[PDB]
Design a protein. Structure first.
Ligand code: HEM
Ligand code: HEM
Ligand code: HEM
Ligand code: HEM
Lengths: 146, 146, 146, 146
């Protein structure tokens, strides 16, 4: 994989306008709603029986913040996401046995959330940069399976 | 598959507020930009070597209009997408040999387009209804292969 | 989708020569070995931390037998897999929350198992018929999600 | 990604028993038969209108030999497939616009061909090594898209 300098600039610049305290819960909650089978990885998170329960669940919001904060840190290591995600790959793959295909689904949900928060600013070219970003994150997190 | 009455209400309701003519060109254009290999099916449209050339291209816009018009008409037949798309499944599969994965990618870009236009109105539930929709469209379009 | 008379003849004909009891344990066992994350749905079967422990495990063998038996019975209803698998789609989707991608992975392993057992008899055409079959099984099993 | 030494030994040892002059055409022909839309990338190859035409087509056989000879060379660089496939990624991605998902399908077809040629020798553990191998090859060939 390879990020162009324009990919870097776009990822870094859009991410600087993202409010992680909102986006985190919105992204994980949306994943749990839209692709419900992913809820089986979060039985300890309490009520996930309805969309309103999921989007208002305080554990979902707290954990989505963690997710996006790790992504925010990863954006400072665009040219070595594999090394940067190595310990999270061991966690998700050797420990939790998360299906690699779900890392792609979360990427799709993040892209949706960015489209919602930025509207027209999320141009085709910007979406392409971020589609490359979430695909590279999925590849880096599933590395222990590969 | 099966659409719920709530899925139908959401799909019909949001689609009535879509500008098919612009949304179609935006959806096809984004597909070509975000998943570049799809450009190989549209060599006759012209130079598609950049986002600006793709999004400014009149044939992309005119064809996107056809695509979303057809999708719109399918929304009158949500319990029978397979039958309603039978002729277009023969065209895409037996004559154009479009990879079935590409029907899913176009569906994913439409969902991004709807998220951009509708913003916070595209709640997790609404996205779930549309994810189901674009999944069912891709199944109906690839029926000839299955 | 649609099975051809040649698809039906091939599927029924080869399946009559399958040893469901051994093939089922081999198919489930391989799924668990080749796509390790699937082990998380079968924690109650015991230690699945190696291929030898998985392939020697009596519960894997006994459950694989159920899976292929059910598949075998579905082969009596090739024009109506959705209806024939309705109850198992509710079980897998609404209760067990099995990711839809996993139904496709089990289908891919069954095709490998059939290739191992039948060798040159599993010609490209025969594989095509079975690929269609295991694709249609996965669609019917994930119907509750779509 | 990471190959274990056991993965290396298995990949190298099985590959040494493979007859590329047969396997090459059998693998590409099978891909063209089982996933027919891939035939659109080979219009110059002549008759691909039937399974017998495809499996007997001399261009398909000649090109499948090239494919597996490149893979055979790649097996001598297991720990750097990305660098080893860089020029083929530029060819397949920037030039030919092959869908990354097809590189996974060819991997699935190769695994089928190995299962056919080796039968029981293709144990679950050996399949797992080779599933990792064809997945890493798909990732290395699609690198220019990523
Ligand atoms: C692909 C983007 C993802 C990233 C950046 C990410 C990041 C993280 C991080 C930072 C943690 C916390 C580690 C710690 O605090 O030490 C974590 C925990 C976890 N992740 Fe992810 N994750 C991702 C996707 C997923 C997906 C797709 C799933 C499954 C649906 C998943 C399931 C979990 C689970 C079950 C935990 C542990 C939760 C608990 O504490 O019970 N993650 N993830
Ligand atoms: C939402 C799913 C899609 C729908 C509803 C759709 C619909 C249509 C329609 C109505 C036509 C026009 C046929 C006529 O003019 O008579 C068409 C043509 C075509 N479609 Fe699609 N399509 C879809 C997805 C795709 C995908 C994913 C691809 C490939 C990436 C594709 C490639 C093509 C090509 C190559 C043509 C012929 C264009 C030409 O000749 O200029 N379509 N499609
Ligand atoms: C060829 C597709 C499949 C078929 C025909 C199938 C069939 C079945 C059947 C007949 C049962 C038994 C229900 C009963 O005992 O009443 C079952 C249980 C189950 N299936 Fe599947 N299954 C398939 C794919 C999967 C996949 C892909 C997974 C997850 C990777 C899965 C996970 C499970 C689990 C967790 C159970 C419950 C086992 C327990 O309680 O011990 N199945 N399946
Ligand atoms: C993933 C495993 C693959 C490998 C190892 C591979 C390898 C190669 C190699 C070595 C060449 C010849 C380059 C030369 O001689 O200089 C080539 C050509 C090509 N490949 Fe692949 N390939 C792979 C998959 C694919 C797939 C999935 C497709 C599309 C269905 C594809 C389509 C082609 C085409 C169209 C050509 C040019 C053929 C001609 O000369 O017209 N390849 N590939």
């Amino acid at each position: 994989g390879h990020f162009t300098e324009e990919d870097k600039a776009t990822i870094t610049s859009l991410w600087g306008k993202v409010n992680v305290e909102d986006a985190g819960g919105e992204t994980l909650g949306r994943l749990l709603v839209v692709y419900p089978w992913t809820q089986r990885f979060f039985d300890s998170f309490g009520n996930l029986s309805s969309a309103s329960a999921i989007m208002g669940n305080p554990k979902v919001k707290a954990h989505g913040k963690k997710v996006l904060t790790s992504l925010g840190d990863a954006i400072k290591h665009l040219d070595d996401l594999k090394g940067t995600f190595a310990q999270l790959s061991e966690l998700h793959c050797d420990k939790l046995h998360v299906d690699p295909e779900n890392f792609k689904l979360l990427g799709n949900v993040l892209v949706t959330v960015l489209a919602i928060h930025f509207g027209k600013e999320f141009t085709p070219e910007v979406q392409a940069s971020w589609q490359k970003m979430v695909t590279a994150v999925a590849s880096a997190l599933s590395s222990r399976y590969h």
